Amino acid sequence: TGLLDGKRILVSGIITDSSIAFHIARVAQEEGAQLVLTGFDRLRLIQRITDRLPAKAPLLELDVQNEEHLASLAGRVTEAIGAGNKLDGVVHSIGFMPQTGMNPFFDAPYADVSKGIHISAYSYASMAKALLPIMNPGGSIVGMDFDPSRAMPAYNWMTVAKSALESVNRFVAREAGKYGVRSNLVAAGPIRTLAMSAIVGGALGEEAGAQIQLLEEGWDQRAPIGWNMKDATPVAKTVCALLSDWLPATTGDIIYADGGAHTQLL
Amino acid sequence: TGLLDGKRILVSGIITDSSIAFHIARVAQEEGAQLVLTGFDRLRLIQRITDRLPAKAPLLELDVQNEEHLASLAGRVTEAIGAGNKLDGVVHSIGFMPQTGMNPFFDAPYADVSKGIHISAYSYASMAKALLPIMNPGGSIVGMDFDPSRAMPAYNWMTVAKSALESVNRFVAREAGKYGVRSNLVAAGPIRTLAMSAIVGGALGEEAGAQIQLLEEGWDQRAPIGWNMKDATPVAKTVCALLSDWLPATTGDIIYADGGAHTQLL
Amino acid sequence: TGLLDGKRILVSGIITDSSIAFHIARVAQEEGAQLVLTGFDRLRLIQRITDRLPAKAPLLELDVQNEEHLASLAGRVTEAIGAGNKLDGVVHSIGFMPQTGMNPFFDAPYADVSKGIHISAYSYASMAKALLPIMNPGGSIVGMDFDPSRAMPAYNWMTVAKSALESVNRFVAREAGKYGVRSNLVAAGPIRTLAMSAIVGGALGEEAGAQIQLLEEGWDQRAPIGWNMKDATPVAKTVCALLSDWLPATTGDIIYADGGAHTQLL
Amino acid sequence: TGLLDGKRILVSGIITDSSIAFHIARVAQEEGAQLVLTGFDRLRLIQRITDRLPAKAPLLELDVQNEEHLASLAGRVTEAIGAGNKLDGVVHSIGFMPQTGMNPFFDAPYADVSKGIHISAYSYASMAKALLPIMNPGGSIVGMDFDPSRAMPAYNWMTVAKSALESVNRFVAREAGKYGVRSNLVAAGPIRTLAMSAIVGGALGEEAGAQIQLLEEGWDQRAPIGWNMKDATPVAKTVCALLSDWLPATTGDIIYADGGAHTQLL
Ligand SMILES: NC(=O)c1ccc[n+]([C@@H]2O[C@H](COP(=O)([O-])OP(=O)(O)OC[C@H]3O[C@@H](n4cnc5c(N)ncnc54)[C@H](O)[C@@H]3O)[C@@H](O)[C@H]2O)c1
Ligand SMILES: NC(=O)c1ccc[n+]([C@@H]2O[C@H](COP(=O)([O-])OP(=O)(O)OC[C@H]3O[C@@H](n4cnc5c(N)ncnc54)[C@H](O)[C@@H]3O)[C@@H](O)[C@H]2O)c1
Ligand SMILES: NC(=O)c1ccc[n+]([C@@H]2O[C@H](COP(=O)([O-])OP(=O)(O)OC[C@H]3O[C@@H](n4cnc5c(N)ncnc54)[C@H](O)[C@@H]3O)[C@@H](O)[C@H]2O)c1
Ligand SMILES: NC(=O)c1ccc[n+]([C@@H]2O[C@H](COP(=O)([O-])OP(=O)(O)OC[C@H]3O[C@@H](n4cnc5c(N)ncnc54)[C@H](O)[C@@H]3O)[C@@H](O)[C@H]2O)c1
Ligand SMILES: NC(=O)c1nn(-c2ccccc2)c(=O)cc1Oc1ccc(Cl)cc1
Ligand SMILES: NC(=O)c1nn(-c2ccccc2)c(=O)cc1Oc1ccc(Cl)cc1
Ligand SMILES: NC(=O)c1nn(-c2ccccc2)c(=O)cc1Oc1ccc(Cl)cc1
Ligand SMILES: NC(=O)c1nn(-c2ccccc2)c(=O)cc1Oc1ccc(Cl)cc1
């Protein structure tokens, strides 16, 4: 008798125990969801990580850049959930931007930007095209986003990728609505993941690290209810809220799991 | 084992069985909530209406224009829920704008506009000031709104009142956060209430009625998942979603229960 | 051969040489505009101030709370510009919020808030209703605004008044368009006026003063082209740009003269 | 004694006499600007078109996909305007999206989308990187945009490209501010160009054509001051307003030359 009791939900984006998707999968499992998981490249690494989730879930290989993976996805999912069964939810927690994109903004070559927008924005439509035929009416497609309304230091082309992702969602909703399915994004505040901690520790340089740290601190002071960058649970709960039947008139939208920071100047 | 199981929630704004608040109260009761209700002026009428809710709830008199009602509210609530007990949720479903405000836009006198903004926008802060001292950490204040981003025909000063209400919410969140309480609004699409049907039937004139009907129709065509103006249940579910613990990092915000219409041009 | 050469423009809101309107009037006069000015209560004070403008302009008494002043305004203006002549532009640089409104947010009584919204938001429509019948096609109504999208400390009910003003503008544009007239707002960054400097110097308290100073500093760091709070000339130029024929397809809108700060997170 | 008297402005995007850039160049020339023009591929066609501008202007070859063109651009411009002279303005009126991108939204392959985002969004930063070193303090970079806030039929991936372009602008402003240069976009309503008329006449199909026509009609009814899709002059004037010194505190922003349509629901 959980929030997602009996729902069949696909969750992508697990790579480490710090991934937002890991906590999405954990909360959803605690809430009665039967999950199908997607992973990219490091499959043996992902299997080991996912063994720590409350329940066992079938792991599938999915590179969003691979057209053959996408074409075979619906088949590979139906084979995992059972014939005659469909998905009730889909979670997109996929994002990437080469080193040059997140180095000055003018120094990122288009090849790097294009790979970033492919994986971070275009993939949301790729996943929808492939999974909507095997989704039930009342279904929910959730994507992971960060507020790209105003420009910020260090994130550069990843912010551009988010602006595109938000636009992609708005169109996915048009297609998803034909199937009785909702399409929405969760705009989260900064969450200290492996990539987030490394960059803050000066992996992408000192100027990048200092800027990210000021962003994080500014977030907790702006957020009326506070913001804990070490806690992905408030984000994971919000995604489950969208996967549930408790937001039935919300599509093409963005739900801000940011502590209320986007609503405050200072 | 419901969404709001064991939560003590105050619900204002019930006047008829078509009121958005009636359905908010119904869904919340179905979800395990113990409710305290507020009514205005026509108390014998409201008692009769509320007798149709799944469970009995104490009815309290509250005119948001009455400073004595607001000052005595916390006391009257604690007396109803029991000493030592606090509220876990508050619902604002209060709105009014004299006939002249919703007649040309330039013809509404300030006395009429001021009464409208008092009841429709200022009251949200009045309620918060009075009920936050008797609210528990993790609490939720929800208000009823409609998207006032772009101007529209016939709604005129009620749209202005909504623009103010959205701004009020953003500040209420600053105060509510001190108490561990969230403050948010639900921006709903058109819902055929008694006031809504009367105005559409030419109560406020022909030009007003025709404009409202075009608004309603335009809403269903824009909304990717459709929009049923005769169904307040998708709205009522969204308010309960905010009263729950499933949106814990959302404050000073607006959740659109509009079928996705605000995200689409046409 | 200036930007507003031969244009007849009404300018309200001059009280001191630090008023945004004083600089609006100065730039417009430098640009070939023949001006009609409105003042409130301290008429002998305003006459003395306005004597410092590049050219002499007729001063008119206008309290926006006075219904008789508004009703007699068109007549008093036509008598000043000459019979058969009309206004080509109108400038609204009027704003007020009692001490309690800008003291905690919950402590402001409605009487104080209502006076604030009357003078700061409703007056924009009052002025439009009165001056549109004496405005020429191609005309321009400009109002002074500050970004109320996100809540901020100390400004409280003045921010709410701005949110309402922006909504009012959107409706004024509907009425103004019938006359071939544009209606827009200029959202300026902080400008060190007499009221602004006093409040920063601890007139409205220490917490208020400290918050305003942090707002000002944060503005210059966010603004890509910088922000000089001691210089109202960039604001005054933007208002003239809207009074000109160089923004002919912009109405119901907001032009941000803020140094680009609203477009940047940090 | 014009708006841009003595200003040296680069204008890209001229292909036909119906191109928004042709009218931008015409108005700017009428306003005292000395222009440098860029063209793509069909150089003999562009030279013939540009011969109809009020004054002769040097034409330069610039494919935004060509890294050698961008690297040699500053040199080729300085050689055209004269050594020691710099640009005071830059106009980006470049946009493209393959046939599949504007066919269902899910059917556009990434190769087509990537080419579109390259030419329509990334190119804005490419141009800025190359031309900022040869731009004077007080300079202005203007880009052509359409409101991508809400999704619409038929435009699909071109809308996504615009959402990215708006984000790109916000970052370009950060870099441009270092040089004392402003960076802004002009969001125009539909303008009947050769590509616009062809698509409306059923070049991209019937469903696409019908949708574009409904968009155009809906624009004129929403716009308080009206909207003439056959007139690019109001757009061209707005770009010149941004190239002027009359909007000195506006950067990373969007100016809507849409007749006020984005501010109105219906
Ligand atoms: N970290 C934050 O603070 C933050 C905030 C808001 C939103 N987000 C978003 O949340 C999502 C997940 O990020 P995270 O913070 O959990 O980090 P993460 O590194 O744990 O997740 C990114 C995931 O993308 C996957 N991925 C990359 N390239 C792929 C490809 N070609 N095919 C398929 N999958 C691919 C990786 O395998 C990984 O699982 C991203 O969309 C990110 O932008 C992050
Ligand atoms: N009807 C719609 O389509 C729609 C859409 C979105 C939001 N809303 C909002 O939902 C809320 C409820 O409206 P509804 O549509 O259910 O209509 P309704 O008439 O049933 O509710 C309005 C309520 O306001 C109360 N009220 C008025 N003056 C009051 C006062 N002085 N003190 C206390 N209460 C007072 C009335 O008693 C009534 O219960 C309003 O805030 C409204 O603006 C309505
Ligand atoms: N100061 C800033 O930083 C800032 C920034 C953006 C926008 N604004 C806005 O600019 C406008 C002008 O403010 P300012 O900063 O120049 O300060 P100001 O004190 O010089 O101007 C306010 C004006 O409002 C007039 N006014 C007040 N009550 C009135 C009434 N009843 N009838 C008629 N006029 C009345 C006053 O006489 C005065 O001229 C206001 O709308 C304000 O909110 C100010
Ligand atoms: N047409 C409208 O209604 C409308 C409305 C708002 C904004 N816009 C924008 O205005 C701009 C100009 O479009 P238009 O309507 O004048 O049409 P247009 O076809 O006349 O202009 C597009 C231009 O892009 C150029 N271009 C394409 N690929 C290029 C490349 N690889 N390198 C360099 N230049 C390249 C073309 O040569 C052409 O001059 C575009 O950015 C467009 O999206 C158009
Ligand atoms: N905390 C981070 O370092 C971070 N990381 N990413 C990210 C980028 C690529 C891949 C995975 C996550 C994001 O997408 C966002 C990140 O933090 C932000 C940045 C900006 C904002 Cl508004 C909110 C959160
Ligand atoms: N359907 C209606 O007639 C209606 N009614 N009210 C309203 C006004 C005063 C009191 C109660 C409800 C609203 O506040 C809003 C109403 O409909 C709208 C109007 C505009 C929009 Cl964007 C969405 C819904
Ligand atoms: N600098 C100030 O102190 C100030 N003052 N007023 C104000 C209020 C009432 C009457 C005149 C001006 C405003 O309306 C705005 C003011 O500064 C702000 C405040 C917030 C923002 Cl976003 C931008 C500028
Ligand atoms: N009228 C059109 O057909 C049109 N064409 N383009 C376009 C696309 C690619 C190249 C040049 C112009 C656009 O970028 C925009 C166009 O019209 C729109 C479409 C949407 C909106 Cl919100 C406003 C105008």
mmCIF file of N, CA and C in Angstrom, chain C residues 57-117:
data_model
loop_
_atom_site.group_PDB
_atom_site.id
_atom_site.type_symbol
_atom_site.label_atom_id
_atom_site.label_comp_id
_atom_site.label_asym_id
_atom_site.label_seq_id
_atom_site.Cartn_x
_atom_site.Cartn_y
_atom_site.Cartn_z
ATOM 1 N N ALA C 57 8.359 73.798 -18.348
ATOM 2 C CA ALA C 57 7.240 72.903 -18.626
ATOM 3 C C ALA C 57 6.054 73.186 -17.684
ATOM 4 N N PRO C 58 4.785 73.191 -18.186
ATOM 5 C CA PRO C 58 3.646 73.439 -17.286
ATOM 6 C C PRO C 58 3.495 72.350 -16.231
ATOM 7 N N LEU C 59 3.376 72.764 -14.966
ATOM 8 C CA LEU C 59 3.206 71.846 -13.848
ATOM 9 C C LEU C 59 1.726 71.779 -13.459
ATOM 10 N N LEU C 60 1.214 70.552 -13.308
ATOM 11 C CA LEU C 60 -0.174 70.268 -12.959
ATOM 12 C C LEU C 60 -0.254 69.464 -11.675
ATOM 13 N N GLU C 61 -1.277 69.728 -10.860
ATOM 14 C CA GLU C 61 -1.477 69.004 -9.613
ATOM 15 C C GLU C 61 -2.211 67.717 -9.917
ATOM 16 N N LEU C 62 -1.646 66.580 -9.483
ATOM 17 C CA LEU C 62 -2.286 65.286 -9.658
ATOM 18 C C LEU C 62 -1.967 64.318 -8.533
ATOM 19 N N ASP C 63 -2.991 64.074 -7.705
ATOM 20 C CA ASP C 63 -3.018 63.076 -6.653
ATOM 21 C C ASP C 63 -3.802 61.967 -7.334
ATOM 22 N N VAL C 64 -3.182 60.803 -7.462
ATOM 23 C CA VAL C 64 -3.807 59.660 -8.127
ATOM 24 C C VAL C 64 -4.959 59.056 -7.292
ATOM 25 N N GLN C 65 -5.030 59.407 -5.999
ATOM 26 C CA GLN C 65 -6.076 58.958 -5.082
ATOM 27 C C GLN C 65 -7.309 59.852 -5.218
ATOM 28 N N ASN C 66 -7.123 61.060 -5.787
ATOM 29 C CA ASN C 66 -8.175 62.049 -6.005
ATOM 30 C C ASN C 66 -8.907 61.829 -7.349
ATOM 31 N N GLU C 67 -10.167 61.364 -7.282
ATOM 32 C CA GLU C 67 -10.995 61.109 -8.462
ATOM 33 C C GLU C 67 -11.314 62.386 -9.259
ATOM 34 N N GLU C 68 -11.367 63.563 -8.581
ATOM 35 C CA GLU C 68 -11.629 64.861 -9.221
ATOM 36 C C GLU C 68 -10.420 65.329 -10.060
ATOM 37 N N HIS C 69 -9.185 65.061 -9.574
ATOM 38 C CA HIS C 69 -7.933 65.390 -10.269
ATOM 39 C C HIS C 69 -7.861 64.641 -11.597
ATOM 40 N N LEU C 70 -8.202 63.335 -11.578
ATOM 41 C CA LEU C 70 -8.185 62.441 -12.742
ATOM 42 C C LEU C 70 -9.222 62.835 -13.785
ATOM 43 N N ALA C 71 -10.437 63.196 -13.323
ATOM 44 C CA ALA C 71 -11.555 63.600 -14.166
ATOM 45 C C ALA C 71 -11.281 64.933 -14.864
ATOM 46 N N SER C 72 -10.548 65.834 -14.198
ATOM 47 C CA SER C 72 -10.204 67.149 -14.728
ATOM 48 C C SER C 72 -8.862 67.177 -15.472
ATOM 49 N N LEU C 73 -8.058 66.084 -15.386
ATOM 50 C CA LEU C 73 -6.719 65.959 -15.980
ATOM 51 C C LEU C 73 -6.652 66.210 -17.493
ATOM 52 N N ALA C 74 -7.450 65.485 -18.303
ATOM 53 C CA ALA C 74 -7.476 65.652 -19.762
ATOM 54 C C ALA C 74 -7.728 67.126 -20.159
ATOM 55 N N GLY C 75 -8.677 67.775 -19.472
ATOM 56 C CA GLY C 75 -9.019 69.177 -19.686
ATOM 57 C C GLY C 75 -7.866 70.099 -19.345
ATOM 58 N N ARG C 76 -7.275 69.906 -18.145
ATOM 59 C CA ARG C 76 -6.123 70.665 -17.660
ATOM 60 C C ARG C 76 -4.893 70.484 -18.579
ATOM 61 N N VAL C 77 -4.710 69.275 -19.181
ATOM 62 C CA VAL C 77 -3.610 68.998 -20.118
ATOM 63 C C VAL C 77 -3.852 69.716 -21.455
ATOM 64 N N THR C 78 -5.044 69.528 -22.074
ATOM 65 C CA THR C 78 -5.401 70.167 -23.354
ATOM 66 C C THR C 78 -5.283 71.698 -23.270
ATOM 67 N N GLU C 79 -5.645 72.269 -22.115
ATOM 68 C CA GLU C 79 -5.530 73.693 -21.826
ATOM 69 C C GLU C 79 -4.031 74.092 -21.804
ATOM 70 N N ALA C 80 -3.139 73.181 -21.339
ATOM 71 C CA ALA C 80 -1.694 73.426 -21.281
ATOM 72 C C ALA C 80 -0.970 73.230 -22.627
ATOM 73 N N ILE C 81 -1.306 72.157 -23.395
ATOM 74 C CA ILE C 81 -0.667 71.880 -24.699
ATOM 75 C C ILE C 81 -1.311 72.633 -25.872
ATOM 76 N N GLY C 82 -2.552 73.078 -25.690
ATOM 77 C CA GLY C 82 -3.306 73.773 -26.721
ATOM 78 C C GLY C 82 -4.434 72.933 -27.283
ATOM 79 N N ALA C 83 -5.566 73.588 -27.595
ATOM 80 C CA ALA C 83 -6.739 72.932 -28.165
ATOM 81 C C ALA C 83 -6.381 72.341 -29.537
ATOM 82 N N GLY C 84 -6.890 71.142 -29.816
ATOM 83 C CA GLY C 84 -6.612 70.446 -31.067
ATOM 84 C C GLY C 84 -5.370 69.578 -31.003
ATOM 85 N N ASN C 85 -4.490 69.831 -30.015
ATOM 86 C CA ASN C 85 -3.264 69.067 -29.807
ATOM 87 C C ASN C 85 -3.514 67.910 -28.854
ATOM 88 N N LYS C 86 -2.803 66.801 -29.065
ATOM 89 C CA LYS C 86 -2.902 65.638 -28.197
ATOM 90 C C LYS C 86 -1.514 65.222 -27.659
ATOM 91 N N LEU C 87 -1.503 64.317 -26.655
ATOM 92 C CA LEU C 87 -0.286 63.767 -26.067
ATOM 93 C C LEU C 87 0.217 62.635 -26.952
ATOM 94 N N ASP C 88 1.534 62.510 -27.072
ATOM 95 C CA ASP C 88 2.210 61.463 -27.844
ATOM 96 C C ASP C 88 2.869 60.439 -26.901
ATOM 97 N N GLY C 89 2.898 60.776 -25.617
ATOM 98 C CA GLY C 89 3.524 59.969 -24.585
ATOM 99 C C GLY C 89 3.081 60.343 -23.192
ATOM 100 N N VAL C 90 3.088 59.344 -22.298
ATOM 101 C CA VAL C 90 2.709 59.458 -20.885
ATOM 102 C C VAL C 90 3.714 58.634 -20.079
ATOM 103 N N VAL C 91 4.236 59.213 -18.987
ATOM 104 C CA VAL C 91 5.187 58.570 -18.088
ATOM 105 C C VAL C 91 4.618 58.507 -16.668
ATOM 106 N N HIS C 92 4.508 57.276 -16.159
ATOM 107 C CA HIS C 92 4.063 56.934 -14.820
ATOM 108 C C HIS C 92 5.308 56.592 -13.997
ATOM 109 N N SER C 93 5.672 57.461 -13.062
ATOM 110 C CA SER C 93 6.820 57.274 -12.165
ATOM 111 C C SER C 93 6.307 57.554 -10.744
ATOM 112 N N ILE C 94 5.186 56.900 -10.410
ATOM 113 C CA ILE C 94 4.447 57.020 -9.158
ATOM 114 C C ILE C 94 4.495 55.701 -8.402
ATOM 115 N N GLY C 95 4.811 55.793 -7.117
ATOM 116 C CA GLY C 95 4.920 54.643 -6.226
ATOM 117 C C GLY C 95 5.016 55.049 -4.773
ATOM 118 N N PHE C 96 4.330 54.305 -3.904
ATOM 119 C CA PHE C 96 4.310 54.526 -2.457
ATOM 120 C C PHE C 96 3.847 53.271 -1.731
ATOM 121 N N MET C 97 4.358 53.063 -0.510
ATOM 122 C CA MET C 97 3.975 51.957 0.368
ATOM 123 C C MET C 97 4.290 52.367 1.802
ATOM 124 N N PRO C 98 3.247 52.520 2.660
ATOM 125 C CA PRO C 98 3.476 52.918 4.063
ATOM 126 C C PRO C 98 4.522 52.085 4.801
ATOM 127 N N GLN C 99 5.163 52.692 5.828
ATOM 128 C CA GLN C 99 6.232 52.124 6.660
ATOM 129 C C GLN C 99 6.034 50.645 7.038
ATOM 130 N N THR C 100 4.790 50.275 7.388
ATOM 131 C CA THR C 100 4.376 48.920 7.775
ATOM 132 C C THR C 100 4.516 47.890 6.629
ATOM 133 N N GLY C 101 4.290 48.341 5.389
ATOM 134 C CA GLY C 101 4.358 47.532 4.177
ATOM 135 C C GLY C 101 5.751 47.183 3.681
ATOM 136 N N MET C 102 6.743 48.072 3.905
ATOM 137 C CA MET C 102 8.130 47.856 3.469
ATOM 138 C C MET C 102 9.083 47.518 4.619
ATOM 139 N N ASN C 103 9.316 46.674 9.818
ATOM 140 C CA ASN C 103 8.164 45.899 10.290
ATOM 141 C C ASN C 103 7.958 44.590 9.494
ATOM 142 N N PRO C 104 7.622 43.461 10.184
ATOM 143 C CA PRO C 104 7.407 42.189 9.465
ATOM 144 C C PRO C 104 6.280 42.255 8.439
ATOM 145 N N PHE C 105 6.383 41.413 7.386
ATOM 146 C CA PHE C 105 5.446 41.304 6.262
ATOM 147 C C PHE C 105 4.009 41.050 6.741
ATOM 148 N N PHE C 106 3.861 40.236 7.808
ATOM 149 C CA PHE C 106 2.576 39.889 8.425
ATOM 150 C C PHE C 106 1.979 41.018 9.292
ATOM 151 N N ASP C 107 2.772 42.059 9.599
ATOM 152 C CA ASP C 107 2.331 43.158 10.454
ATOM 153 C C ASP C 107 1.717 44.333 9.700
ATOM 154 N N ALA C 108 1.830 44.363 8.366
ATOM 155 C CA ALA C 108 1.242 45.444 7.573
ATOM 156 C C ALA C 108 -0.294 45.313 7.525
ATOM 157 N N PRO C 109 -1.056 46.311 8.065
ATOM 158 C CA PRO C 109 -2.531 46.232 8.002
ATOM 159 C C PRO C 109 -3.027 46.503 6.586
ATOM 160 N N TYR C 110 -4.174 45.913 6.189
ATOM 161 C CA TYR C 110 -4.697 46.084 4.831
ATOM 162 C C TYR C 110 -4.887 47.542 4.386
ATOM 163 N N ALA C 111 -5.274 48.452 5.301
ATOM 164 C CA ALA C 111 -5.464 49.866 4.984
ATOM 165 C C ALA C 111 -4.190 50.449 4.365
ATOM 166 N N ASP C 112 -3.016 50.063 4.920
ATOM 167 C CA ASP C 112 -1.709 50.504 4.445
ATOM 168 C C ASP C 112 -1.366 49.886 3.097
ATOM 169 N N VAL C 113 -1.634 48.581 2.942
ATOM 170 C CA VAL C 113 -1.376 47.839 1.701
ATOM 171 C C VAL C 113 -2.240 48.406 0.556
ATOM 172 N N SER C 114 -3.547 48.593 0.815
ATOM 173 C CA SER C 114 -4.526 49.139 -0.120
ATOM 174 C C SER C 114 -4.122 50.532 -0.610
ATOM 175 N N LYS C 115 -3.573 51.384 0.279
ATOM 176 C CA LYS C 115 -3.103 52.720 -0.107
ATOM 177 C C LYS C 115 -1.898 52.574 -1.065
ATOM 178 N N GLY C 116 -1.035 51.608 -0.765
ATOM 179 C CA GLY C 116 0.143 51.306 -1.560
ATOM 180 C C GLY C 116 -0.188 50.807 -2.950
ATOM 181 N N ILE C 117 -1.064 49.787 -3.050
ATOM 182 C CA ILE C 117 -1.513 49.229 -4.331
ATOM 183 C C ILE C 117 -2.301 50.291 -5.138
#
